[PDB]
């Protein structure tokens, strides 16, 4: 039971869980298909290809698909751009009220 809420809040998903937003085994061509036209907020955070241990946060935004690189710092940390979190589900709750470009992060994309 306990299936289905309501709630004055656009940002409603857990950050921390990455079955949630994190698309582990995802590439390119197909996180773009994910977010490519989708309603405007949508992301994902893949395994990053161009880099080893990097990340890519694919969001949808301007009738495309923002990808977010979040480079990975020696401090455990993860750099997002400009900007500096304390982890993965630090830096998209951090956002949640943010708007990075044009808009915010509203939820992530579906399995």
Request: charged residues 20%; hydrophobic residues 30%.
């Amino acid at each position: 039971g306990s299936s289905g809420s309501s709630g004055m809040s656009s940002a409603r998903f857990d950050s921390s869980d990455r079955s949630a937003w994190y698309m582990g085994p995802v590439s390119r061509q197909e996180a773009q298909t994910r977010l490519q036209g989708q309603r405007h907020g949508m992301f994902l955070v893949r395994d990053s290809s161009t880099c080893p241990g990097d990340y890519v946060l694919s969001v949808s935004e301007n009738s495309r698909v923002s990808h977010y690189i979040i480079n990975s710092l020696p401090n455990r940390r993860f750099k997002i751009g400009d900007q500096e979190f304390d982890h993965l589900p630090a830096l998209l709750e951090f956002y949640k009220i943010h708007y990075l470009d044009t808009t915010t992060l509203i939820e992530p994309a579906p399995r």
